[PDB]
Amino acid sequence: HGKRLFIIKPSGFYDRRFLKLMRFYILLTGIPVAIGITLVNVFIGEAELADIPEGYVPEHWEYFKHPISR
Amino acid sequence: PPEPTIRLQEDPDPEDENLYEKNPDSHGYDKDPIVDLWNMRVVFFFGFSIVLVLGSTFVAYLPDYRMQEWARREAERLVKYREANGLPLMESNCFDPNKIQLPEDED
Amino acid sequence: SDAPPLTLEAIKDRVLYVLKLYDKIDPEKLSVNSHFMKDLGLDSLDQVEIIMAMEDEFGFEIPDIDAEKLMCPQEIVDYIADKKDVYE
Amino acid sequence: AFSAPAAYLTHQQKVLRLYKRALRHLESWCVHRDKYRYFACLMRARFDEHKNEKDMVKATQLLRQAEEEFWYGQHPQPYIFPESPGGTSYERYECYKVPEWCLDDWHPSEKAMYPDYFAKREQWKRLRRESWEREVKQLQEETPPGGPRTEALPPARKEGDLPPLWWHIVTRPRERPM
Amino acid sequence: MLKIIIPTTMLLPMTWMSKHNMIWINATVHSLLISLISLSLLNQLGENSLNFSLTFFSDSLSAPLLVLTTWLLPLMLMASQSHLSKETTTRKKLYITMLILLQLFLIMTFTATELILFYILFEATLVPTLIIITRWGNQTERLNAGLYFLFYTLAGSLPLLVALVYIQNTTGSLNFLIIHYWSHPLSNSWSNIFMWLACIMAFMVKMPLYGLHLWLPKAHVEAPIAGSMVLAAVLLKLGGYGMMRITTILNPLTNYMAYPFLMLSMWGMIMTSSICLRQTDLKSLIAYSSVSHMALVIVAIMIQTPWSFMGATALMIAHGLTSSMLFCLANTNYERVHSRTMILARGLQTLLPLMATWWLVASLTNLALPPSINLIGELFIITASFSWSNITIILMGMNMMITALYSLYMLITTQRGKYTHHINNIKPSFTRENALMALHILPLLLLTLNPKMILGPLY
Amino acid sequence: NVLQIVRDHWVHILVPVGFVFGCYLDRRSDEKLTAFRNKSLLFKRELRPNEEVTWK
Numbered sequence: 001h002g003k004r005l006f007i008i009k010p011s012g013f014y015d016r017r018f019l020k021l022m023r024f025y026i027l028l029t030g031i032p033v034a035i036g037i038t039l040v041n042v043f044i045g046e047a048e049l050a051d052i053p054e055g056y057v058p059e060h061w062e063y064f065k066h067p068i069s070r
Numbered sequence: 071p072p073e074p075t076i077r078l079q080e081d082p083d084p085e086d087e088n089l090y091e092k093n094p095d096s097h098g099y100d101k102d103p104i105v106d107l108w109n110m111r112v113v114f115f116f117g118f119s120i121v122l123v124l125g126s127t128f129v130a131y132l133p134d135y136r137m138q139e140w141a142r143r144e145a146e147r148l149v150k151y152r153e154a155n156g157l158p159l160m161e162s163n164c165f166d167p168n169k170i171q172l173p174e175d176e177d
Numbered sequence: 178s179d180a181p182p183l184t185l186e187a188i189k190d191r192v193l194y195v196l197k198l199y200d201k202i203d204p205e206k207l208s209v210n211s212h213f214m215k216d217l218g219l220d221s222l223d224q225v226e227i228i229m230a231m232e233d234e235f236g237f238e239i240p241d242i243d244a245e246k247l248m249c250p251q252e253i254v255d256y257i258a259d260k261k262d263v264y265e
Numbered sequence: 266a267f268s269a270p271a272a273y274l275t276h277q278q279k280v281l282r283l284y285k286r287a288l289r290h291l292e293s294w295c296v297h298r299d300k301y302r303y304f305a306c307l308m309r310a311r312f313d314e315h316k317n318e319k320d321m322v323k324a325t326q327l328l329r330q331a332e333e334e335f336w337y338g339q340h341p342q343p344y345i346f347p348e349s350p351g352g353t354s355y356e357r358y359e360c361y362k363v364p365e366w367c368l369d370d371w372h373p374s375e376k377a378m379y380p381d382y383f384a385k386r387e388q389w390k391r392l393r394r395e396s397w398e399r400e401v402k403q404l405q406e407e408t409p410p411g412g413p414r415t416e417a418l419p420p421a422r423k424e425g426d427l428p429p430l431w432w433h434i435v436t437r438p439r440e441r442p443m
Numbered sequence: 444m445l446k447i448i449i450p451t452t453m454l455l456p457m458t459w460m461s462k463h464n465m466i467w468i469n470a471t472v473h474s475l476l477i478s479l480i481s482l483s484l485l486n487q488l489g490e491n492s493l494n495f496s497l498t499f500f501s502d503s504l505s506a507p508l509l510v511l512t513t514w515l516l517p518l519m520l521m522a523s524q525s526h527l528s529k530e531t532t533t534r535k536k537l538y539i540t541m542l543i544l545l546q547l548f549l550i551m552t553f554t555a556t557e558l559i560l561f562y563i564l565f566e567a568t569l570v571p572t573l574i575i576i577t578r579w580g581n582q583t584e585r586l587n588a589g590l591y592f593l594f595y596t597l598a599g600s601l602p603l604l605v606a607l608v609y610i611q612n613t614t615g616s617l618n619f620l621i622i623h624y625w626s627h628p629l630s631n632s633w634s635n636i637f638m639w640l641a642c643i644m645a646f647m648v649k650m651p652l653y654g655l656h657l658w659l660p661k662a663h664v665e666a667p668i669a670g671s672m673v674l675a676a677v678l679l680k681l682g683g684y685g686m687m688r689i690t691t692i693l694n695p696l697t698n699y700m701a702y703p704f705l706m707l708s709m710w711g712m713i714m715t716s717s718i719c720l721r722q723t724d725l726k727s728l729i730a731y732s733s734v735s736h737m738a739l740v741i742v743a744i745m746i747q748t749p750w751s752f753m754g755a756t757a758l759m760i761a762h763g764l765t766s767s768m769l770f771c772l773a774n775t776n777y778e779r780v781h782s783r784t785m786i787l788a789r790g791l792q793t794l795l796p797l798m799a800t801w802w803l804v805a806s807l808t809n810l811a812l813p814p815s816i817n818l819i820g821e822l823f824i825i826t827a828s829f830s831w832s833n834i835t836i837i838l839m840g841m842n843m844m845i846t847a848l849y850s851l852y853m854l855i856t857t858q859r860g861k862y863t864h865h866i867n868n869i870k871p872s873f874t875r876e877n878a879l880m881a882l883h884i885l886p887l888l889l890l891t892l893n894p895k896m897i898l899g900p901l902y
Numbered sequence: 903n904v905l906q907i908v909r910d911h912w913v914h915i916l917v918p919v920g921f922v923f924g925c926y927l928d929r930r931s932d933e934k935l936t937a938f939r940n941k942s943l944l945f946k947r948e949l950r951p952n953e954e955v956t957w958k
């Protein structure tokens with residue numbers, strides 16, 4: 001049936017544009033951060049606890065576990 | 071009463087100007103489209119991309135200067151020592167009574 | 178919903194159907210433009226019962242101020258079409 | 266709703282209103298159709314006995330005990346049509362009603378869609394722009410001095426004229442836009 | 444600490460040497476950069492403090508407040524960009540200068556190793572706010588509002604200077620570290636009672652305490668949007684921070700001294716929440732909600748327990764963010780309608796759906812919906828008050844119910860129903876306003892993931 | 903084009919210069935509070951063979 005009518009509604013252009021822009025920038029910086037975190041976790045991090053060897057004094061950043069924290 | 075009924079020479083109240091009329095895609099920052107667009111870009115980038123993401127990640131991975139796991143390990147070793155030696159865990163007095171000189175009442 | 182888009186012809190047919198089911202008014206005498214008080218000799222109470230019958234037929238109710246000045250089937254159909262936004 | 270109200274209600278209108286209310290509430294009490302028909306005919310018979318009474322004082326004394334009797338037995342939960350001011354769907358679709366002027370703020374990319382509709386809208390705008398200037402003077406010349414006495418508006422009397430104050434009555438959104 | 448202070452000072456020459464059409468962009472970019480630098484301060488220790496020098500220190504009570512203060516300036520600039528369009532370049536630069544000076548005074552106030560320096564900066568914040576209120580204000584009552592705001596604060600804080608100089612003459616120091624380490628009990632004496640009053644009233648009047656809160660509705664309603672944002676977000680928390688810093692020397696006098704103020708706050712939260720139910724102005728309603736929240740913070744500080752302090756810090760941060768967002772939404776409505784009346788513009792969800800979503804989220808956060816930090820502070824303070832006395836639960840529950848009531852009333856009156864017919868100048872919401880609301884709301888939901896960052900030194 | 907955009911973009915360098923100057927001033931003020939370096943009873947430590955100061 002060719003009874004298609006017009007739906008009067010406010011402009012959804014600006015709302016959609018703002019949402020797209022916000023998502024674009026958030027992802028623009030979050031995707032590299034997530035990729036870097038994943039690579040660091042798989043390849044490098046998660047040190048294991050040890051005893052301090054006698055006669056050796058560690059530096060301040062050697063008392064932490066996660067590599068990004070160090 | 072030939073008075074003009076006018077108190078003073080005043081400009082009429084101007085009508086508010088729509089930013090969309092002279093420039094669609096106006097972003098609500100400025101009336102000049104180029105400065106407007108660059109203001110939108112810098113605000114979105116430097117807020118969402120830089121601060122809201124990088125600073126949040128930085129805060130998430132802050133090193134333990136509050137020393138929580140250190141306290142966990144200290145408590146674990148102390149409870150291991152005390153259970154094994156028969157000591158009754160935590161002690162009621164925080165300081166050893168031998169080193170406090172109470173004042174004699176003699177009442 | 179699944180409600181068919183009723184037209185002016187359907188509204189007029191239904192109004193005339195309910196009017197012809199009204200034994201007080203003879204079927205032959207009535208016409209789309211036939212007046213109520215003068216052309217068919219009905220009382221005002223008959224008019225309000227006719228309005229109520231229209232209301233029960235079409236499933237919506239007409240305010241009293243509008244109903245009290247609906248005196249012909251044609252203007253009843255026009256009122257219903259205006260209320261329900263009927264195209265043709 | 267559409268008709269302009271009067272300064273007061275006459276006795277005859279009040280009697281009709283009571284008759285309609287009593288019939289509706291009797292139908293609400295009498296669910297079944299045959300019982301309702303019987304009691305409605307009995308109600309009409311009781312109602313038209315004093316049809317031919319003449320003096321105003323006894324007529325005014327009547328309809329009053331009638332209203333009190335109606336209020337005593339008014340069926341505290343009457344039937345209401347769904348779209349009525351008390352129905353279960355009175356203002357269900359009022360959130361889907363958008364004004365017509367909202368289309369003036371659409372982005373040109375949005376107005377690219379539906380070009381014929383917006384051309385027709387522009388034609389309507391031109392028609393309104395001329396008709397308003399005609400209507401202002403027409404209403405100024407037709408109104409009684411000292412201000413209107415009722416909120417009833419006159420129709421158009423010339424050839425190219427349009428009814429005064431027509432834009433916001435013709436351009437209602439719809440009953441069920443969505 | 445100078446790595447934050449010096450860039451804030453350099454904001455002034457940068458603003459005054461900027462192009463006529465590049466002040467907003469440069470100010471926003473550099474303010475956001477300054478805020479990023481401030482994030483480093485959050486790392487805190489379970490030990491004493493971050494003692495940078497003899498003049499300034501940082502703590503996990505001062506760090507969230509400093510971060511919020513640095514974060515607020517870009518939002519205030521974004522909000523002020525709109526209504527100052529038809530202003531001359533010199534006056535816009537003066538407005539930005541006022542905002543920068545206020546930020547600098549607040550930053551130096553929150554570190555403030557020594558109490559007289561704290562008083563000096565705590566009073567220096569009074570001038571830029573007064574100029575902003577009485578210069579760039581729309582109505583004619585801005586002058587009276589500024590007079591109230593100035594004189595309430597000064598009458599409250601003048602005895603504090605005498606109390607501080609007396610305390611330094613007797614003890615010998617006003618450095619907070621020495622004050623904490625050399626603290627001595629206060630004997631129950633009339634002189635000690637009046638010293639307690641002089642130390643407490645200056646911070647009480649700026650909370651505002653119920654019965655001394657008259658200046659706040661005037662100042663908030665008559666201020667421009669940036670002034671309202673800063674007053675609701677940071678300037679109210681100065682009194683709470685000062686009370687938290689100064690209640691260390693008021694013991695054991697505080698145990699019985701607190702009763703008049705505890706009763707006033709406990710009844711005044713109910714009073715102001717009920718006032719919010721019958722209000723015809725958005726800004727006045729938001730201001731009275733702020734009064735209720737700050738009264739509950741006063742109760743928390745007066746109870747003086749670790750849970751009280753953690754809840755008070757969390758509630759201060761959450762209230763600052765929420766009140767700023769609510770004021771921004773009200774300003775967005777006002778710049779379209781120019782009325783500032785709740786009942787005029789109705790059913791705005793049909794016309795502005797995303798702004799209605801922002802309204803809903805802001806109302807839910809003000810309603811203290813879990814697990815938002817608003818409810819974290821609310822619940823910690825409620826538990827501490829219950830431990831103080833089991834009868835407080837009635838007043839706390841009444842306050843919670845009335846708070847939900849007027850929050851949803853404000854949401855429904857403006858967003859739901861039928862649109863006003865004769866209002867046809869409601870343009871689509873700009874990207875600037877949407878970004879403002881997003882930057883207000885996202886930090887709250889990110890902070891609820893790490894609540895330990897805003898729970899203060901007693902965590 | 904250099905020597906023209908500088909006249910309009912010279913202002914941008916100021917906030918950053920302030921930050922590095924503030925860091926330098928913080929370190930310089932830190933230099934004046936070394937009265938107890940490697941003298942605290944908790945962190946009293948013997949120096950490394952190539953160590954002059956425990957912290958800077």
Ligand SMILES: CCCCCCCCCCCCCCCCC[C@@H](O)O[C@H](CO[C@H](O)CCCCCCCCCCCCCCC)COP(=O)(O)OCC[N+](C)(C)C
Nearest residue numbers: 066122125126129130131507510511514886889890892893
């Ligand atoms: C929109 C439609 C949906 C799309 C999105 C779908 C994906 C859903 C994901 C969104 C939320 C889901 C919940 C998932 C949570 C996982 C992340 C979480 O684990 O990280 C948190 C970390 O989050 C951060 O800590 C909190 C964010 C920082 C908040 C600071 C605000 C940024 C500055 C802005 C200005 C400040 C204004 C306010 C002043 C105070 C807590 O981590 P934690 O267990 O702890 O330890 C981290 C790992 N360690 C062990 C290595 C240390």
Ligand SMILES: CCCCCCCCCCCCCCCCC[C@@H](O)O[C@H](CO[C@H](O)CCCCCCCCCCCCCCC)COP(=O)(O)OCC[N+](C)(C)C
Nearest residue numbers: 630631632633634636640652653654655699700703704707
């Ligand atoms: C207006 C909106 C609110 C503004 C803020 C209001 C908060 C300020 C209220 C001040 C708190 C209380 C002040 C003093 C409290 C001490 C307790 C004392 O009052 O109670 C009895 C005191 O008895 C009598 O009250 C003596 C005082 C009588 C004179 C005071 C005037 C009473 C009403 C004045 C209220 C005016 C407030 C507003 C001023 C403009 C106890 O008897 P006593 O054991 O012997 O004294 C113990 C104290 N010692 C040990 C130092 C001796």
Ligand SMILES: CCCCCCCC/C=C\CCCCCCCC(=O)O[C@H](COC(=O)CCCCCCC/C=C/CCCCCCCC)COP(=O)(O)OCCN
Nearest residue numbers: 595598599602605606609634635637638640641644648655
């Ligand atoms: C929003 C408006 C609120 C205004 C503030 C209201 C409270 C003001 C506080 C009282 C004013 C004086 C403060 C005292 C200054 C501190 C100095 C001190 O504590 O030393 C006391 C000094 O104590 C006093 O002298 C107090 C005298 C009070 C005179 C001024 C009266 C002002 C009004 C007082 C009543 C109102 C106070 C509460 C107001 C409630 C809120 C409106 C002891 O002095 P010494 O002689 O050295 O030691 C005794 C042993 N030889």
Ligand SMILES: CCCCCCCCCCCC(=O)SCCNC(=O)CCNC(=O)[C@H](O)C(C)(C)COP(=O)(O)O
Nearest residue numbers: 220221222277280287290291312315324327328331335
């Ligand atoms: C379930 C609910 C309970 C029921 C209780 C209700 C009790 C109602 C009983 C009261 C009976 C009466 O009419 S009370 C009597 C009041 N007085 C008059 O009726 C005098 C003149 N009558 C008129 O003018 C009428 O309008 C009329 C001529 C009928 C139509 O005229 P039209 O030509 O313009 O249609």
